[PDB]
Amino acid sequence: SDIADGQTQRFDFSILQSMAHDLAQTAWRGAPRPLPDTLATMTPQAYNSIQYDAEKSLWHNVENRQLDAQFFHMGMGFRRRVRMFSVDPATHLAREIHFRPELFKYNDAGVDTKQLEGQSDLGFAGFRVFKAPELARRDVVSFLGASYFRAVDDTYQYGLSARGLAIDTYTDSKEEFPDFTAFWFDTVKPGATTFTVYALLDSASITGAYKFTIHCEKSQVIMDVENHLYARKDIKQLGIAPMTSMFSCGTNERRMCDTIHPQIHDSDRLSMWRGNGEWICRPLNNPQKLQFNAYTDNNPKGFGLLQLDRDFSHYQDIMGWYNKRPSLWVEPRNKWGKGTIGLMEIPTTGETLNNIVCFWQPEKAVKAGDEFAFQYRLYWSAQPPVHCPLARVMATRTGMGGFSEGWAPGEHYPEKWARRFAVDFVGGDLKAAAPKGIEPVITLSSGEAKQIEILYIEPIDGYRIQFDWYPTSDSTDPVDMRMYLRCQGDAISETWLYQYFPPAPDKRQYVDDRVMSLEHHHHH
Amino acid sequence: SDIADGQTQRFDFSILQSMAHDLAQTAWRGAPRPLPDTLATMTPQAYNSIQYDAEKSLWHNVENRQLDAQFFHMGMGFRRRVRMFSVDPATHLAREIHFRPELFKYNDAGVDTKQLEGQSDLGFAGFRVFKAPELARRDVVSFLGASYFRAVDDTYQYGLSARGLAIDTYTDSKEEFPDFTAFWFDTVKPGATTFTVYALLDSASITGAYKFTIHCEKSQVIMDVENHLYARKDIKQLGIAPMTSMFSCGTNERRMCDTIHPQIHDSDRLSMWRGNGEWICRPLNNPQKLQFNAYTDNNPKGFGLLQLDRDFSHYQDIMGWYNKRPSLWVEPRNKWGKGTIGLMEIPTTGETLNNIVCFWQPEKAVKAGDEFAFQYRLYWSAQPPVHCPLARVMATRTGMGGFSEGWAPGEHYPEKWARRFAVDFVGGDLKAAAPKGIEPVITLSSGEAKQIEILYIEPIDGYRIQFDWYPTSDSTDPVDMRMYLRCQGDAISETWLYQYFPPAPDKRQYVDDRVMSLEHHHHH
Ligand SMILES: OC[C@H]1O[C@H](O[C@H]2O[C@H](CO)[C@@H](O)[C@H](O)[C@H]2O)[C@H](O)[C@@H](O)[C@@H]1O
């Protein structure tokens, strides 16, 4: 009856650490063996019409179950055979769920199932967990990819994603993508919306043992992650608790915004809570040139890629519902010590490319034989679980300056070239601080802040800081900008880090291409 | 006590039509005489520090006054001396209000009030009306300019303008700006929010007698307008009931949208209700080339420039509050017969130039001696007083096309060049009609409509019609597009008229200037 009917074996979190440790001592298993021909040469239509059998779900036998799970068929870009096991947490005894065609319904699929018959080694691509009131529709957790996984809050819309690990995302060499190659699921308890799933990570450079304790709460999904990592080789770049999102069109430097969509992004900013208590808002970019930024920290308290613009009218996407897509908050649960938060921002021209990658990278160079243990909570939800207790950046608007706000000239372009920055703040003591006097403190790597203005914005009960950036140089070098609000010498806001790309000096001017002629009269 | 203290003279609407018609028999009075030297050479500071004395207001002596009025001082571009009169409607007697310096507080004006002592013929630039509970501050109606005037709804935010008359706005010659040279004010009744103001129009080409019965309602201003017009010369273009708005950056053809404001406009569309009963929604353009359009009609039922996007977040303007600015509806009160609704859209690069002019222009060529009479109601309010009983366009969005919606390529631009149009409809019977089948009927001057899609939009309970436009020709000639929704042989929506400007053939392609280099790593 239960789908998991393989050889019984003892399993616990330490046996997996041993598996992973022992595995690190041998040669990497290498790239996956080709799939059976019937799957190797599949049209998307064909794959898509393969459907896991809902009545053979992982936990079909558990009464009052509030959670169930199904498996994705191997095929398409899923070339790694992920093995799946069921663990009775009472007896610490695991049984393998072997792939078999009986587990699936191949409908209008022209799949030669006969060549799948003895392929009990095929395993699956990954898995999804459903929660009540619907246990076979609208998954809330999905592990499917390499180390990749994602989840949803009460909107049920999937957005940014996370991975078990990142290796060499940005270096002299090509990036390496560790696979999760096996998952052990503790049988859910009747009534529970918490489930436990251990995973084995395997890769040319490194193995790991992972435990995921996953809480499908009413408003969000919380994941208690513990990992143990075993380097096989020297590693150039190790990325702990990595996130992957997309940013094409935002309120900032809008250079890829010729769609019907006012904004296009899965996430709009990096939030960092630093070990010293400082909060940072790093508005994400769609740079024309690939960028890596490393934010030095020690014992980071938290960091996330957030989607805080929840307004459909700002996106107009009735396919992907970007306004419903969630935020991801990484809460270190042990002291991670010295290192950097890496943000890679890749140039994109649409929404098909996850062009945003963020992770933690320990200070210390990774050498063959090094071992690591990280614990962290992930919160999949619209609003992060924590935010600055002070004035918070709500939005970072950028555009032409060189004029007076409200009086942008209609007949000529502006006299001088400048770039306008508008940073709206909403938050704590802004109201009580306002009479006492709010000074923005601005810091620029290059250029001069001019026409600094502080303006009340009734509709969001906040304050807008505008300044015009005037260049001092012919340099196209990135401009690292920094801003916070001050009041009687004390800071009253989070810090805003921005990365501006000044245009070429030949393009620091406007081309006025208008024509005012009696050539275009039309009668209807 | 009252400020009206010139010579008693009989006055009524007939007597003004006589002044106007008699005035037409003589030569135009010509361009205004130079102002006194102190006002000719004024800093905008100096002028702005002149304040009409609220204790000398027009209706200071009326008890239970729900309305009052004040005058604008002559100066700056106010060069025509407008004469102002008070009428007792009981006795049909009218006393002039002569300019006297004592009616104003000059403050830090730096003005030789002594060369303003004798000047009884100076008059004023214009007038404004205030309504309780603020009869000295938030104005609701303002006549100031030439034939120009404007009003506000319960937002109390000024936006687009009207005029008495438009002359030669688009022809071989330069435009002619008739001036309101005198106003007569029926004294307000106690308790009344209706007031009546008569106006004399005077211009090189034409004179006129205007009556404005102006209702300052709770939620809007309604103006009952009657004029009589007396042509002194042949006239190339006569524009009745004209409107003047602005449109810089909307959701359509976003060619001037590099501001911190997602949208900048005082109006977004030309709404027409034709003699035959057909409704038209013509979204306004900010074209790079000056356009005139003439929409043929017979006994037009109504027309207006509407500001239907009420959403602060779509504009982010806290100076001019575009979201609060009103719609203006012209409702002809008699059968105006054959002619054209004229729409001139001038190129702009900001908000300072009113680049939208719309008016009625009768079929018949205007010759000297001609007399005209129009009656129309003006509705200054957010929502026009009447709209299509069918489905209504809510927004016209344009952008890149040639890809599948929601899968815009990230690593390349689209293979082929096309322009995407997305018209959202939010009207009636769309829900009942969807099962029966909603056919979009598209008409194109040039090019072909491919990838035509009908998509339900939950958040506005509406339907989005998208099409890619592919060129058939190397021509840059404007493309008239026309769309309505049909179901079972019947039209179920208003007609959408759009005017598209294809780009030069050499620019019907995308330039891919991305770079993927290790050149830009940054440590903080
Ligand atoms: O399930 C989502 C995708 O996951 C995989 O893709 C990620 O992992 C790959 C490593 O095998 C990377 O090369 C890739 O760039 C990542 O997106 C999977 O292979 C894809 O086909 C899935 O869409």
Q: Do both A243 and A361 map to the same domain?
A: yes
Q: A121: which 2 tokens?
A: 């080694």
Q: How remote is the C-alpha of A219 from its chain's centroid?
A: 19
Residue A150 and residue A11 share a domain = yes
Q: How far is the CA of A418 from the centre of ligand 1 (A)?
A: 41
> What's the gap between Cα B453 and its chain centre?
34
Instruction: Of A349, A230, A145, A431, give the one whose Cα is nearest residue B516.
Output: A349
Q: State in Å: Cα A179 to ligand 1 middle.
A: 10
- Distance from the alpha carbon of residue A146 to the mean position of ligand 1, in angstroms: 6
Question: DSSP string covering A285-321, please?
Answer: ---SB-EEEEEEEES--EEEEE-----GGGT--TTT-
Q: How many Å lie between the alpha carbon of B179 and the closest alpha carbon of chain A?
A: 24
Minimum-distance CB partner of B413 among A251, A346, A349: A349
- Show the 3-state SS of A184-213: EEECCCCCCCEEEEEEEEECCCEEEEEEEE
Of A482, A479, A512, residue with least CA distance to A253: A479
Q: What angle do CA B506, B508, B511 make, to 5 degrees?
A: 85
- CA gyration radius, chain A: 26
The size of the A-B interface in CB pairs under 8 A is: 216
Angstrom CA distances, A74 to A119, A122, B170, B224, B514, stand at 11, 7, 68, 74, 35
Contact B60/B97 with Cβ under 8 angstroms?
no
CB contact (8 A) between residue A399 and residue B262: no
Rounded-to-integer distance, Cα A249 and Cα A314, Å? 11
Cβ count near B88 (within 10 Å): 14
Q: Are residues A273 and A398 in the same domain?
A: no
Identify the helix (H) or strand (E) that includes residue A40: helix A37-40
Joined tokens for residue A54: 């809902």
d(CA A27, CA A158): 37
Q: Residues enclosing ligand 1, CB less than 6 A?
A: A 76-77, 144-146, 148, 177
Identify whether residues A5 and A132 lie together within a single domain.
yes
| β-sheet bridge partners, residue A192 | none
Whether residue B130 contacts residue B139, with contact meaning beta carbons closer than 8 Å, is answered with: yes
Question: Within this chain, do residues A124 and A70 fall inside the same structural domain, yes or no?
Answer: yes
Question: Residue A524: closest CA among chain B residues belongs to which residue?
Answer: B295
The partner residues of B304 in beta bridges, in order of sequence, read B271, B329
Domain boundaries, position A252: 237-365
Residue A500, chain B, CB below 8 Å: the answer is no
Residues 226-265 of A with CB under 8 A from B: 246, 248, 251, 254, 257-262, 264
- Exposure string of A114-134, with b = 16+ CB inside 10 Å and e = fewer, is eebeebeebbbbbbbbbbeee
CATH number at residue A74: 2.70.98.10
* Rounded-to-integer distance, Cα A151 and Cα B155, Å: 43
In a domain, B523, yes or no: no
Residue ending a domain, choose from B358, B381, B404: B381
The span from the CA of A255 to the CA of A258, in Å, is 8
The alpha carbon of B227 is separated from its chain's Cα centroid by a whole number of angstroms, namely 19
User: Which chain B residues are closer than 8 Å to A260 by Cβ?
Assistant: 251, 397-399, 420, 422, 466
Q: Are B163 and B157 in contact (CB under 8 A)?
A: no
Using alpha carbons only, give the angle A293, A335, A305 rounded to the nearest 5 degrees: 40
CB within 8 Å of chain A, chain B residues 331-360: 340, 346-353, 355
Kind plus residue range of the DSSP H or E element containing B291: strand B291-298
Q: What are phi and psi of B304, to 5 degrees?
A: -160, 160
Cross-chain CB nearest to A258 (options B313, B400, B480): B400
CB-based contact A139:A129 (threshold 8 Å): yes
Domain count, chain B: 2
- Cβ-proximal residues to A103 (8 Å cutoff; 6+ apart), any chain: A3, A52, A53, A56, A71
In a domain, B441, yes or no: yes
Burial A367-403 (b: 16+ CB within 10 A, else e): eeebebebebbbbbbbbbeebbebbbbbbbbbbbbbb
B409 to chain A: which residues are within 8 Å by CB? 349-350, 352
A374 in a structural domain? no
Q: Are residues B361 and B422 in the same domain?
A: no
Any domain includes A512 = no
Q: Which of A253, A449, A237, A241 is nearest to A363 (CA)?
A: A237
Report CA dihedral (A243, A249, A251, A252) to the nearest 10 degrees: 80
Question: Does residue A197 share a domain with residue A304?
Answer: no
Q: Please indicate if any CB of chain B lies within 8 Å of the CB of A108.
A: no
How far apart CA B144 and CA B121 sit, in angstroms, is 18
Which among B391, B438, B396, B392 has a CA at the least distance from the CA of B419? B396
Residue A323 near residue A316 (C-beta atoms within 8 A): no
Residue A229 near residue A382 (C-beta atoms within 8 A): no
Report yes or no on A373 lying in a domain. no
Tell me, yes or no, whether A7 and A122 share the same domain. Answer: yes
A136 occurs within a structural domain = yes
User: Chain A contact for B522, CB < 8 A?
Assistant: yes
Q: Which residues contact A201 (CB under 8 A, 6 or more apart)?
A: A20, A147, A164, A165, A178, A179, A180, A181, A207, A208, A209, A210, A227, A229
Q: What is the CATH number of the domain that holds A440?
A: 2.60.40.10
- Which chain B residue's Cα is nearest to A420? B260
**Which H/E stretch holds residue A19?**
helix A13-25
Q: Can you read off the two tokens belonging to residue A3?
A: 């789908």
What is the Cα–Cα distance from A49 to A47, expressed in whole angstroms?
5
| Token representation of residue A20 | 């992973």
Nearest chain A residue to B263 by CA: give it. A262
Q: Which bin fits A129, alpha (ψ -120 to 50), beta or left (φ > 0)?
A: beta
In a domain, B520, yes or no: no
CA atoms of A256 and A264, how far apart (whole Å): 9
Residue indicated by tokens 């490319």 = A353
Experimental approach = X-ray
A382, A383, A385, A390 alpha-carbon torsion, rounded to 10°: 170
Rounded Cα distance between A316 and B398, Å, is 12
φ/ψ of B508, rounded to 5, equals -95, 60
Candidate of A73, A76, A139, A148 to mutate for ligand 1, largest count of ligand atoms within 8 Å of Cβ: A148
Length of chain B: 524
Is B458 in contact with A524 (Cβ distance < 8 A)? no
- B residues 33-92 lying closer than 8 A (beta carbon) to A: none
Indicate whether B210 and B234 sit together in one domain: yes
Q: B394: nearest CA in chain A?
A: A313
> Does the beta carbon of A465 lie under 8 angstroms from any beta carbon of chain B?
no
| B147 Cβ under 8 Å from any chain A Cβ | no
Q: Which residues of A touch B351 (CB under 8 A)?
A: 406-408, 410
Rg (C-alpha) for chain B, rounded Å, is 26
Please tell me whether residues B342 and B426 are part of one structural domain.
no
Using an 8 Å Cβ cutoff, are A515 and B290 in contact? Answer: yes
Q: Token pair of B341, please? A: 């609704």
Chain-chain contact of B455 with A399 (C-beta, under 8 angstroms): no
Q: Residues B473, B478, B480, B481: what is their CA dihedral angle, to the nearest 10 degrees?
A: 70
Q: What is the DSSP string of B456-507?
A: EEGGGTEEEEEEEEEPSSS----EEEEEEEEETTEE-BPEEEEEE-PPPGGG
Give the CB-side neighbour count of residue B484, counting CA atoms within 13 A.
Answer: 15
Q: How many CB atoms lie within 10 A of CB B505?
A: 13
**Phi, psi dihedrals of residue B19, rounded to the nearest 5°:** -60, -45
Q: Among B7, B13, B159, which Cα is nearest to B98's?
A: B7
**Dist CA A195 CA A214 (whole Å):** 5
Residue written as token pair 């064909």: A46
Q: For residues B174 and B190, what is the distance between their CA atoms, to the nearest angstrom?
A: 46
Distance of residue B159 Cα from the nearest chain A Cα, in angstroms:
13
Picking from A171, A246, A313, the nearest residue to B314 by CB comes out as: A313
* Last residue within a domain, chosen from B381, B411, B443: B381
Residues 390 through 429 of chain B touching chain A, CB cutoff 8 Å: 397-400, 403, 405-413, 420, 422
Q: Please, are residues A418 and A402 in contact by the beta-carbon 8 Å criterion? A: yes
Closest in A293, A311, A318 to B313, CB measured = A311
Residue B247 near residue B345, CB atoms below 8 Å:
yes
After which residues do gaps appear in chain A, with C to N over 2.5 Å? none
Same domain, A153 and A26: yes
Nearest to B271 by CA among B263, B257, B282: B282
Last residue of a domain, one of B320, B349, B381: B381
Q: Measuring CA to CA, how many Å separate A107 from each of A35, A45, A52, A71, A75? A: 20, 11, 11, 17, 15
Is residue B312 classed as helix, strand or coil in its secondary structure?
Answer: helix
- Distance CA(A281)–CA(A283), nearest Å, equals 6
Q: Give the single-character DSSP code of A175.
A: P
Together in a domain, B147 and B250:
yes
Please tell me if residue B132 touches chain A, with a CB cutoff of 8 Å: no
CB-CB under 8 Å, A409 with B349: yes
What is the rounded CA–CA span in Å between residue A122 and residue A37? 13
**Alpha-carbon gap, residue A411 to B254, rounded angstroms:** 18
Whether B277 is in a domain gets the answer: yes
Question: Whole-angstrom Cα distance, residue A242 to residue B36?
Answer: 74
| Alpha carbon of A177 to ligand 1 centroid (Å) | 9
With beta carbons less than 8 A apart as the criterion, state whether A104 and A203 touch: no
Q: Give the residue, by CA position, lying nearest to ligand 1 atom 22.
A: A145
- Other CB atoms within 10 A of residue B488 CB: 9
Does any CB of chain B come closer than 8 Å to the CB of residue A480? Answer: yes
List the residue whose alpha carbon is closest to atom 17 of ligand 1.
A145
- A-chain CB neighbours of B497 within 8 Å are 524
Token pair of A200 as six digits = 């084995």
Identify the bridge partners of residue B167 per DSSP, sorted by sequence position: B176, B238
- Residue position matching structure tokens 């006025």: A512
Instruction: Copy the structure tokens of residue A482.
Output: 């920094």
* C-alpha of A175 from chain center: 17
Span from the CA of A241 to the centroid of ligand 1 (angstroms): 17
